[PDB]
Design an enzyme around this catalytic site. Structure first.
Site, PDB file in Angstrom:
ATOM      1  N   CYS A 267      13.157  12.325 -25.617  1.00  0.00           N
ATOM      2  CA  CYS A 267      13.963  13.265 -26.386  1.00  0.00           C
ATOM      3  C   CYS A 267      14.142  14.616 -25.708  1.00  0.00           C
ATOM      4  O   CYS A 267      14.796  15.493 -26.282  1.00  0.00           O
ATOM      5  CB  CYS A 267      13.353  13.477 -27.776  1.00  0.00           C
ATOM      6  SG  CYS A 267      13.678  12.134 -28.943  1.00  0.00           S
ATOM      7  N   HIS A 443      19.719  13.203 -34.972  1.00  0.00           N
ATOM      8  CA  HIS A 443      18.817  13.156 -33.823  1.00  0.00           C
ATOM      9  C   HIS A 443      19.485  12.363 -32.706  1.00  0.00           C
ATOM     10  O   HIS A 443      19.436  11.131 -32.685  1.00  0.00           O
ATOM     11  CB  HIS A 443      17.473  12.549 -34.210  1.00  0.00           C
ATOM     12  CG  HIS A 443      16.415  12.706 -33.162  1.00  0.00           C
ATOM     13  ND1 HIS A 443      15.115  12.288 -33.349  1.00  0.00           N
ATOM     14  CD2 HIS A 443      16.465  13.238 -31.918  1.00  0.00           C
ATOM     15  CE1 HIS A 443      14.410  12.555 -32.265  1.00  0.00           C
ATOM     16  NE2 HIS A 443      15.206  13.131 -31.382  1.00  0.00           N
ATOM     17  N   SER A 740      61.763  28.966  23.274  1.00  0.00           N
ATOM     18  CA  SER A 740      61.870  29.894  24.398  1.00  0.00           C
ATOM     19  C   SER A 740      61.137  31.210  24.151  1.00  0.00           C
ATOM     20  O   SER A 740      60.343  31.645  24.992  1.00  0.00           O
ATOM     21  CB  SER A 740      63.343  30.160  24.711  1.00  0.00           C
ATOM     22  OG  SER A 740      64.074  30.474  23.538  1.00  0.00           O
TER      23      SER A 740
END
Ligand SMILES: *P(=O)(O)OCC(C)(C)[C@@H](O)C(=O)NCCC(=O)NCCS
Lengths: 1016, 928
Positions: A267, A443, A740
């Site tokens: 728990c 619970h 270029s």
């Protein structure tokens, strides 16, 4: 600076916001009754912050509703609580950081699927315990003995509404595999996704990162269904029911590279997992921690066993925590998750801190009065250890989230422990408030800690304490006055004994494992820690401000919508369009919606909607919902194979006001432009920023002293600034090809040369070209022209022209040549016989020809000193016949390379063809105007690529800010590297950032029923 | 740079417990099997999986599978009586929990750390488990399933029950990372130890093959299980692995704690790391990049360059596809930069033991710990040849298929342990051997001491004395203690026992668990020890054996007596042969020299001093000072071994020592008090002579019966009530013999004391003013121990009360009578049954026994420290032995200190038999 002047300024501010008397609104009445609301409070807080420099939180501002209290608290700060005398030192012994909670995901009984729903239920005091659903445990009710045994038990508790639903398509799971997966793993995946969404952290940004997963589980209930018939059981159940897979699959699906372990302490599993995640975060080893716990009531075996034990389950199923009629508890199923980061990381990443975890500790009961008997001494020791780790005196705790199992024997023990540690030394008028979430949710065996942590995080974030229900009266065996404890059975404010909210969460397993976590609210302290061109800049800014005052422009807000499938993306776009048209969407700024969308997951299929207001966004989303094309919508079904290629073109791409608009409206672009301008001033002794900021400069002979040099220098600066701006948002080139004049920028972006070396190279080239052309005039000039002759077809025509030379192969069917004017028009006239295309360039630069021969010696001397470096990016050197060069190769950008590039021709189309042959389909050009995009498209079309991605950065007669936003949007759509969050930076930290995000709809899942057909 | 970025300590391995296939139940057996290259994979036992073979479909499906692997010989046996479990509860317990308990006990025994000493301590438990196989048997019939299975089959209970039974107060969690569970548990234990939070860490993993469901599923997967059941790691014919069951445990402590506690360090853990594969080519597909990253992270944490690694304990699952990936990762990290002549040796224990799913890490760690401790590298078996898909020369790797020495490339042995679960979880632990650097960091009386030492040396040369070695035997039951004593007696008589010194046997016994039932055998050689153990085996009493069936309810009471307990050479023998006693005697002598200006050590070391009028200038004062010094030294010597008094009761001259031991006064204050009292008594007696002298006598009159006789004698006063039926009185000599003659009429016992001290009477009245002035300055303190103040009518005083030892208290004690028997009666009424006397000679033990007998306590424990005509060293050993036997506070390990750290401590311990368990069959009757 002082209290009185701050009060006067606040009165003036509220008067300006409301238009009142401005001299009789300094009453003790709150701002809410003065006419203000929550909307303008954010703006007022921002104005206070930008003037005083102090950041105010929401709770601090709301707790001081009147003008005088706010004025006192802004200058003098929060009043310091009176000192108290303690015999112990509770300061931290170790040097560790605090842990910040940034995301919460809930899956709890009562249809509490989001933190907002859970908070509303807690405020309402809802009871989530119901009877056993009629569709649950049906696999066991067909056996008469099991059926009659189940009816004798309690079977009341918290159950999930839909436990069989699962979106297997979203998580890429087959039906056979999905049917054998424990619902705990499904809950873990769903809660991980929901917690990542709640934290506003994109899931795609955490792939490959060190993210730790700590999930607590207790029972493998789904295994029993799989092995009901051993022969019919499928081998998929081995992976679908294992406890380690609960975290391993989460790590696998989200591509997490941190620790992945499943804990089991009955728990206290969730609290132990949270403690392990915190300890991992404090010790390096991880950057983001995902903690929580899950529990599912799949089979009635555990409930029947607990009922057969006797005196454990409440007859009515309600948990009466600390009540006079507590007679047990009831089992519930659910889960929850938390996202944990170091507080410094959360502060630097702009995350919204919901709560702060100060410390935690775990221990065991030891040899108690039986295995299942709790030990008060161990609970007191774990409380002391946790508060020592947290560095907080237990006397300052305001609220305690107790275990609260509702047992007539364990509640006195827990209260005794709390009085021993938490309640010791407190005055009678300052008790620690007590409550439990098990009274509401039941619970949750392995998920009690997750529920308690979520409840306390919501309580700290919302500045309220939810009540505790099923409390008829105080326990006769508990002396609350002596223990200095009080049960909070109503909605109440935080007492704040120490001046800040401090809470503790406790949880004990039935095996003797104890845990305690100390939490506190986030505080304000956790969120802290060129002369001539100047006048042109000032006047340009002042003229821009004047135009904006006449008519304010509408910002372009990119809206990112993405999903793992195109159909899901269309559905999400339709839902977003529906939400925006709603009154809630209309009340939210378009920038907030974009910021909220930019922090969502960026999936495989992406789309971007470019809108200026709500109506355009709605129209674009409606168009995106179907397959209809729209000019304001950019979309693609998937990413491209290879990265993008940056094209450093720029010849003939200049215009009057190139780069001026973006310089004023962007800071990174301006910074890099200033840096290049400083470099050029060091080299050439003049500022190019003056030319850029000037309005009447046409970059021609009539407006520039050196038209040839300045155009090249400004174009180079613009290219560098655009590339660095793209790098600022996360964009990076996979390969670089130059032309270029763009060779210096290509070398800089490829890592061959530094910024200074490339700047010196381009300055030397431009200045030599400008100076040499001055002496060459009359009949010695050379003119460049464009013809429709290919590389090999031009060999035959050149037999009639010995002095003509080739300058650059722009296209497979086009070529630029240069020579004497009497010899250039001759081949042009010959080309006109076949009706081809031929034009004469109007620029006297005449590069890549014999005219540049005298400049080689001067070029070599000036360039002597550059330091070439190995390439960090793929390079298509047009000087070296367009040959691809792998990253990490030997340096190539020596003096001879530049001499050859300036003297010899440029093989532009060969490099593009090689890039196409290498699998590159996306080409991005960094130039003030897209000129070479046509050449790149012509080359790609001839190479067998008719759907190449050609992206431009800046263009003529186009808004420069919107052009860059659209360019990055295309990169994002095609799956290239780009941080979409950088497009919506945050300017505020505290209360002023309350409206930074909108309440956009969350991701929707298509849940299907996946379950194992079992019988007994 | 591979140096550590964090400031953390190294972790020392001190205990190893093994439960592995092939009957490898001890580290020595496992090491011998590894050296022999034993193959521990066998067929499925005939008595296994019988609950599922009665179903034709399941039976025919099992025969199709492989079912070959490593199985335990006795998986159903369990000693439920030892762990205090009922049959109903024991039948429902997962064998994983039984293995966890047994391996914890065996690892604690191997570490030579008593289990009783870790009760209530912060000891962390980290056990890795993967499957709850025993749950399926419980739920075979849901109705017949018992609720005990909820606790007997839960995964957290595997560690929770271990913490509960051993009374551990540290973290207790069960981890689950499939095949890296043991390594992850070890990493978590190491991280806990480095961050405080724990002092001792118990790490390991367990795995049991209870049901064939997992094996049948893996066989149905296909291409996972080897057809012959052998694991051919890195071989050219690798075709899978086989599942095995077992478990192992390790005891982990910080290296500084292990060094300070005298533990034998077997191996050192430098660092570890864990990570995950991420998005690989499937959930079950290993990722070489993640393995390389975890190797780099582990070696960064350990602070060791991977180029210096000598041996790698690889995963070695014997798969044709995973071995190349692991070798590629090792070559990426470990093998990178090595010269061709210095390869990293490679091997795997799965070739010997099979694939222990959740216990592979424990087996690998045990193997590497044994290899480091024994300085040998065991071979790897089932290696026909190099894998064609692995280029060992390029990866700088070599398979160790023979017994070879450590190459020691960096000068020290460095090893790495790897383990990867099938879910993507990876772990790596870096280990190194223990090094030598880890085990480090009064003038006249002088001549008398020198001559006493030189005379003692001369006597020892003529005849060396035999040391008394206490042998501690204990168990949770008396019968188990007798069985253990019989087994130890059998072992000692064996030739191996004869070749071991008796001190080593005692040291080995002192570090075992001290159970509820204890016994001590005092012997000088092997024969006496054997005879004592044989006597202890039965219920026969023996003078050399001290035994008791259980501890007493309350702690002991220290009696600070000493009047008339002096003799010629008290404390001389113990001063020369004990260092703590000598140190405290010197400290008290220095204090007395500061106070009285002369040294009592000269009197103690002198031989011809009788402490009488003919040999001492101040016979009254010096006797009291020497007795006080001896009492203080004896009390501090007892405190050195862990003894502490529950309550303290003093007598006429022992009040200063009682106050010092009760915390009322400091040593200096008590010394000043006793010096002032003795000097005032000595000086006052000199002027009182002739007819004014007072004589003290002992009579047989009780406290109330003496009231009637005192009506005839007005000047007689009561000195001390020694016994309920005896009283000491003092008065004029013509009045003292009168009551004595009256007492002789009834035939009672009466004697006249020969000491002219005459304390606790009217004679001390002139000395009160002088006593008050000298005592002005002492600082009383609250009592930290229970006190029976004989001055305050023998009233018990709870610890932590207000200070009582002020000047008026001493004045009243010196002037008024002493209620000695009242305090003893109150102590008996408070539940105290053990009385210990600190004196050179036991004189008040008879009085205490008489008082206890009259109080209804005929079996009280009366313990003496020093006695006349007795060896002082042996007397103290016997006194502490009685305290240990009756369950009082005493660290028996302090009786056998270690004088060496490294190789010189090789023979400090003997190979005594281990604890024996009575295993019974506990299983769930299930059918299908
Ligand atoms: P308004 O009615 O739009 O309210 C907006 C708000 C400022 C209250 C809210 O959206 C916000 O951003 N802050 C919430 C602060 C909070 O919930 N905790 C303190 C409550 S006193």
């Amino acid at each position: 600076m002082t209290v009185n002047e701050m009060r006067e300024w606040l009165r003036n501010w509220v008067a300006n916001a409301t238009g009142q008397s401005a001299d009789a609104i300094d009453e003790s009445t709150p701002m809410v009754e003065l006419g203000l609301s929550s909307r303008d409070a954010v703006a007022m807080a921002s104005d206070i912050e930008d003037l005083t420099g102090v950041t105010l939180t929401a709770t601090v501002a709301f707790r001081h509703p009147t003008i005088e209290s706010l004025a006192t608290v802004i200058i003098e700060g929060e009043p310091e609580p009176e000192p108290y005398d303690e015999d112990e030192d509770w300061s931290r012994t170790r040097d560790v950081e605090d842990i910040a909670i940034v995301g919460v995901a809930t899956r709890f009984p009562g249809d509490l699927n989001t933190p907002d729903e859970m908070w509303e239920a807690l405020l309402e005091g809802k009871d989530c315990v119901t009877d056993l659903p009629e569709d649950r445990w049906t696999e066991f009710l067909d056996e008469p003995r099991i059926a009659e045994r189940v009816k004798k038990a309690r079977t009341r508790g918290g159950y999930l509404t839909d436990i069989k639903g699962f979106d297997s398509e979203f998580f890429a799971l087959s039906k056979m595999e999905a049917d054998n997966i424990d619902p705990q793993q499904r809950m873990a995946l769903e809660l991980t996704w929901e917690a990542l969404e709640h934290a506003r952290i994109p899931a795609s940004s955490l792939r490959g990162e060190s993210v730790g997963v700590y999930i607590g589980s207790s029972t493998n209930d789904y295994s029993f269904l799989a092995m009901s018939d051993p022969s019919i059981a499928h081998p998929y159940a081995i992976t679908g029911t294992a406890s380690s897979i609960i975290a391993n699959r989460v790590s696998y699906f989200y591509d997490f590279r941190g620790p992945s372990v499943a804990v089991d302490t009955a728990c206290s599993s969730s609290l132990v997992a949270t403690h392990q995640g915190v300890q991992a975060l404090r010790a390096g080893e991880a950057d983001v921690a995902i903690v929580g716990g899950v529990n599912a009531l799949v089979t009635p075996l555990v409930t029947v066993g607990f009922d057969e034990v006797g005196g454990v389950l409440a007859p009515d199923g309600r948990i009466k925590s600390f009540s006079s009629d507590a007679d047990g508890y009831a089992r519930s199923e659910g889960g929850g998750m938390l996202v944990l980061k170091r507080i410094s990381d959360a502060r630097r990443d702009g995350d919204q801190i919901l709560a702060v975890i100060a410390g935690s500790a775990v221990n065991h009961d030891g040899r108690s009065n039986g295995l299942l008997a709790p030990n008060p001494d161990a609970q007191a020791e774990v409380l002391r250890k946790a508060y020592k780790d947290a560095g907080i005196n237990p006397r300052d705790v305001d609220y305690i989230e107790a275990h609260g199992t509702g047992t007539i024997l364990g509640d006195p023990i827990e209260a005794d422990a709390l009085g021993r540690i938490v309640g010791k030394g407190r005055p009678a008028d300052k008790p620690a408030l007590l409550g439990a979430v098990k009274s509401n949710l039941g619970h949750l065996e392995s998920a009690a800690g997750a529920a308690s942590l979520a409840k306390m995080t919501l309580a700290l974030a919302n500045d309220k304490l939810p009540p505790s229900i099923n409390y008829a009266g105080p326990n006769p065996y508990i002396d609350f006055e002596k223990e200095r404890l009080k049960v909070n059975d109503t909605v109440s404010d935080w007492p704040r004994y120490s001046g800040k909210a401090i809470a503790g969460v406790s949880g004990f397993g039935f095996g003797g494992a104890n845990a305690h976590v100390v939490m506190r609210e986030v505080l304000a302290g956790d969120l802290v820690e060129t002369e001539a061109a100047q006048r042109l800049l000032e006047q340009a800014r002042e003229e821009l401000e004047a135009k904006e005052a006449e008519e304010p422009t509408k910002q372009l807000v990119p809206l990112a919508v993405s999903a793992f499938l195109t159909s899901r993306k269309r559905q999400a776009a339709a839902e977003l369009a529906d939400w925006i048209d709603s009154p809630e969407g209309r009340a939210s700024s378009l920038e907030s919606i974009g910021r909220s969308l930019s922090r969502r997951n960026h999936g495989r299929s992406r789309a971007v909607v470019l809108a200026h207001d709500h109506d355009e966004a709605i129209k674009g989303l409606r168009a995106l919902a179907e397959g209809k094309q729209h000019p304001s919508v950019l979309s693609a079904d998937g990413p491209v194979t290879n990265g993008p290629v940056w094209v450093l073109a720029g010849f003939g791409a200049q215009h009057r006001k190139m780069g001026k608009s973006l310089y004023l409206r962007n800071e990174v672009f301006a910074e890099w432009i200033n840096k290049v301008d400083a470099l050029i001033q060091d080299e050439r002794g003049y500022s190019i920023l003056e030319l850029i900021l000037d309005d009447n400069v046409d970059y021609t002979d009539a407006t520039c002293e050196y038209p040839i040099e300045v155009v090249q220098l400004v174009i180079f600066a613009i290219q560098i600034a655009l590339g660095e701006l793209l790098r600022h948002h996360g964009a990076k080139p996979a390969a670089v090809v130059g032309q270029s004049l763009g060779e210096a920028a290509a070398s800089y972006f490829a890592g061959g040369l530094s910024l200074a070396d490339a700047t010196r190279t381009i300055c030397s080239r431009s200045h030599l070209m400008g100076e040499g052309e001055a002496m060459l005039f009359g009949e010695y000039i050379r003119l460049m022209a464009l013809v429709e002759y290919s590389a090999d077809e031009i060999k035959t025509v050149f037999s009639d022209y010995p002095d003509l030379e080739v300058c650059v192969y722009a296209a497979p069917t086009q070529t630029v040549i240069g020579g004497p004017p009497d010899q250039v028009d001759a081949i042009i006239a010959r080309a006109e016989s076949e009706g081809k295309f031929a034009r004469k360039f109007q620029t006297k630069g005449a590069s890549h020809t014999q005219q540049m021969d005298p400049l080689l010696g001067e070029l070599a001397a000036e360039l002597q000193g550059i330091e070439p470096k190995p390439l960090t990016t793929g390079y298509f050197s047009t000087v070296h016949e367009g040959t691809f060069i792998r990253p990490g190769s030997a340096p190539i950008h020596d003096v001879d390379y530049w001499k050859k590039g300036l003297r010899h021709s440029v093989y532009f189309t060969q490099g593009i063809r090689n890039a196409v042959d290498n699998g590159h389909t996306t080409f991005l050009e960094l130039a003030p105007n897209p000129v070479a995009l046509m050449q790149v498209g012509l080359t790609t079309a001839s190479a067998g690529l008719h759907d190449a991605q050609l992206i431009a950065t800046l263009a003529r007669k186009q808004d420069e800010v919107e052009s860059m936003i659209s360019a990055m949007a295309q990169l994002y759509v095609h799956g290239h590297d780009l941080d979409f969050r950088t497009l919506f930076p945050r300017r505020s930290k505290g209360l002023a950032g309350a409206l930074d995000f909108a309440n956009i709809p969350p991701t929707r899942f298509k849940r299907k029923e996946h379950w194992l057909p079992a019988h007994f």
